[PDB]
Design a protein around this nucleic acid. Structure first.
Lengths: 126, 109, 98, 96, 154, 80
RNA sequence: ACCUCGGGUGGGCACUCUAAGGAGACUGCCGGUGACAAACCGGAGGAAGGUGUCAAGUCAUCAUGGCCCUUACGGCCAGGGCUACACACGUGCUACAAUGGUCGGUACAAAGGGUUGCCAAGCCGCGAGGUGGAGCUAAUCCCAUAAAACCGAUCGUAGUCCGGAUCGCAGUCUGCAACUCGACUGCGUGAAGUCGGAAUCGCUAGUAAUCGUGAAUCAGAAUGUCACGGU
């Protein structure tokens, strides 16, 4: 069927999309997007691929992804919009290079260095 | 007399008591069950709900009565040859703080 | 020094020399079941009964060198061993990873 | 079955002698349940002069495995308790 | 000496529909909280026009008229007096001084509504009678004694 | 800390020339071999000298003392 | 299915719970420059593509000298006398009183070492979780409570109702060792924080940048470089 497995990841996650076709319905983390979130702007940043792939009338999206911070896996809703849909078809394949929202940025907080203050935040010298 | 010292207006009623030093979490039940409303000032309401908020002045310690024993116990430490008056004769921290030199707000001039 | 490394090392058998009166006198003090006349009976305990019965003057060191700093809970050895032990292979499981 | 073993290389070679030698005797033993790397960072000094800018990294690993026997009668857990070590493996056993 | 960096502007605003305004949460983010920033990123743009009569993208765009300079203030040596460099420059220079200094006068007003004390200056550029417009006309007539130094001794 | 979880002071070996010396008159100073050693709250007005190794100090004790160490008659660091 | 919709539990091996170890990331390729050549400029795919040095700190943590204490630093229960404030400062979180002056509240941290240890909901509480003890070998838990959000109150812009430096006295916890000095911040009091200018610590990309450490030779106040600064 359309009973698939996609995964968005920010801060070492393992996600669950219970995806099916429909008409533009969004939900996240056993909640709605108007239910867990609100008092932010990061909800409809994901609108930017969503309205340009014209899937606002075709799919039902429920990407549970947990962990991180307040607006940290608000950076994971960035990723998991088209992963479990390009495993269906190949229409929007080359039409998503303009956005560029899949690469898990490895410029996060890596290994801990002594002598410095943080990863590569340098201390006071003379 | 009204809160001991003459009081500037245009500020809060519980904080008119919570005037530098013993209060709010002990007066948490005083201003809430006497009926005296925190929501308005000491004057603009009825002028009658201060009468028990003025009696607390002369029961334990007063602005005049804190000056009474401000020299008795210090006289107990200066000429008895002791160490609470060895760093009072000098002027250091007494209760074992950051000890000798380069201390922020304990020595003064 | 010679009269130092063999006079505080003997605290293994002198601090717990008694070792049976030292536990029969130090638990029911933490119990409030003692009566108001009985503040004194539990205080004939350990001091004039010669006073190597407390443990406020012992320190943890290395064995072959005797360095007190660099001592951890996972060894009986110190900071000048770890560079020269597991490369000759004196320590198990100490392997470099990330 | 629970052990108390060292690392990656002395339990992944110690459980190979367990499950196949317990399946030979007509019994049913389940497969290996994983356990990742025991993350703990260690910091010591290495400089001959006393120096605060010099620390480093170390680790000791600790890896154990969850197993269980469905019909408990196995001599693989008691007689092959002396086989499943080589130099310093200490095989704990559980009758599960 | 080679320029190795690649200019990557990322502009996609969730509700506001701007063109050049979207990613600006950098000095509105005062190393703190985003939920504190929610009435002042766009909620202050929903607070500019509430006493006015337009759309808040009307007044924002026209900051590239009279608080944007004409010449540049970088210092250069020949063998003598250190000459600055007046020239007609591409918009990335002069309009860089038309957005970030317009908000930089926000502490000497100190009024009610934290949301209003950031964006209570943007509507003053309709005639251009605010705070950043005074220094832009200072630039042009402190460039008379320099304007011939572009090829000769520059 | 240092509250009155420890109410009394029943110390037996710091005692046997103190509590017995009530019936005997006060003509000699009770010398002490520690910087720690204390005595009863019902004997108030004895003399204890600060014990460290070179010379002794004037020690004056009145009726109203309840709190802490003997470290005030001679100081901790006596300003050499 | 059920649930108190916290999952008692079979089933969760596929629409998974933090992977031991792994094809791993390109001079790979076409084209214009250059002697065609090192490179340097540009395009792939695809919500991933070009990275042997500076007469100086230790004859003292293993070492090693010219003289020494030689009824002795082979004796040790040691009869206390190392901060007059009289300065420059290596200066290096914290604010500029207005986002305005005082709390017990939010979708909410939560596991390991744990056979002389870590020390429940506490009965104690405004805030003290000594007798208690769910956890005694921890997909368990003791600090187990918490996240800078909504519109937070009266009043709407202050060297002061942020202000307490000697006068907490004194309150059944190591337990033979708290006789003019300690956590327990309850805020009645006793201040010096007003665009950083003389000139200089020093910021070209994950950066200039304000949420904390749990555990011993088996007794828990190891602070400028703190297991995650969600910007």
């Amino acid at each position: 069927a359309t009973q698939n497995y996609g995964t968005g990841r920010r801060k070492t996650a393992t996600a669950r999309v219970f995806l099916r076709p429909g008409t533009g319905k969004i939900s996240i983390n056993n909640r709605g997007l108007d239910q867990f979130f609100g008092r932010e702007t990061a909800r409809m940043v994901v609108r930017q691929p969503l309205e340009l792939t014209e899937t606002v009338e075709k799919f039902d999206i429920f990407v549970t992804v947990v962990g991180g911070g307040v607006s940290g896996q608000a950076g994971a809703i960035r990723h998991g919009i088209t992963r479990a849909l390009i495993e269906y078809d190949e229409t929007l394949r080359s039409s998503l290079r303009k956005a560029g929202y899949v690469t898990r940025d490895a410029r996060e907080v890596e290994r801990k260095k002594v002598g410095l203050r943080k990863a590569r935040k340098r201390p006071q010298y003379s | 007399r009204i809160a001991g010292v003459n009081i500037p207006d245009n500020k809060h009623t519980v904080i008119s008591l919570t005037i530098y030093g013993v209060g709010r979490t002990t007066a948490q039940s005083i201003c809430a069950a006497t009926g005296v409303n925190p929501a308005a000032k000491i004057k603009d309401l009825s002028d009658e709900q201060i009468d028990q908020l003025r009696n607390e002045v002369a029961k334990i310690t007063t602005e005049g009565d804190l000056r009474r024993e401000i020299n008795m116990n210090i006289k107990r430490l200066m000429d008895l040859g002791c160490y609470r008056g060895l760093r009072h004769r000098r002027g250091l921290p007494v209760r074992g703080q950051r000890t000798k030199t380069n201390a922020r707000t304990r020595k003064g001039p | 020094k010679e009269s130092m490394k063999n006079r505080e090392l003997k605290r293994q058998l002198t601090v717990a020399k008694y070792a049976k009166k030292r536990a029969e006198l130090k638990a029911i003090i933490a119990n409030p079941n003692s009566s108001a006349e009985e503040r004194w009976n539990a205080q004939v305990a350990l001091q004039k009964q010669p006073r190597d019965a407390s443990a406020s003057r012992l320190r943890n060191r290395c064995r072959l060198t005797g360095r007190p700093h660099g001592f951890y809970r996972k060894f009986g050895l110190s900071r000048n061993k770890l560079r020269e032990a597991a490369m000759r292979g004196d320590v198990p499981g100490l392997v470099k990873a990330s | 079955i629970r052990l108390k073993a060292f690392d990656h290389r002395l339990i992944d070679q110690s459980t190979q002698e367990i499950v196949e030698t317990a399946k030979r005797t007509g019994a049913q033993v389940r497969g290996p349940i994983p356990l990742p790397t025991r993350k703990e960072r260690f910091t010591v000094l290495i400089s001959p002069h006393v120096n605060k800018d010099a620390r480093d990294q170390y680790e000791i690993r600790t890896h154990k495995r969850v197993l269980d026997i469905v019909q408990p009668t196995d001599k693989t857990v008691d007689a092959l308790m002396k086989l499943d070590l080589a130099a310093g493996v200490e095989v704990q056993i559980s009758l599960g | 000496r080679r320029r190795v960096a690649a200019k990557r502007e990322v502009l996609a605003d969730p509700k506001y529909g701007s063109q050049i305004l979207a990613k600006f949460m950098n000095h509105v983010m005062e190393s703190g909280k985003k939920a504190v920033a929610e009435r002042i990123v766009y909620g202050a743009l929903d607070k500019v026009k509430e006493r006015g009569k337009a759309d808040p993208l009307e007044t924002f765009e026209k900051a590239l008229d009279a608080i944007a300079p004409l010449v540049e203030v970088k210092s250069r040596r020949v063998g003598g007096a250190t000459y600055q460099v007046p020239v007609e420059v591409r918009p990335s220079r002069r309009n860089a001084l038309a957005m970030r200094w317009l908000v930089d006068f926000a502490r000497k007003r100190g009024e009610k509504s934290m949301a209003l004390r950031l964006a209570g200056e943007l509507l003053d550029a309709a005639e251009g009678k605010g705070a950043a417009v005074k220094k832009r006309e200072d630039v042009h007539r402190m460039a008379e004694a320099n304007k011939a130094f572009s090829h000769y001794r520059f | 800390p240092r509250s009155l979880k420890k109410g009394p002071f029943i110390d037996l070996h710091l005692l046997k020339k103190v509590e017995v010396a009530v019936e005997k008159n006060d003509r000699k100073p009770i010398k002490t071999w520690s910087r720690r050693s204390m005595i009863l709250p019902h004997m108030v007005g004895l003399t204890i000298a600060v014990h460290n190794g070179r010379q002794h100090v004037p020690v004056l004790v009145n009726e109203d003392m309840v709190g802490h160490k003997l470290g005030e008659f001679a100081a901790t660091r006596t300003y050499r």
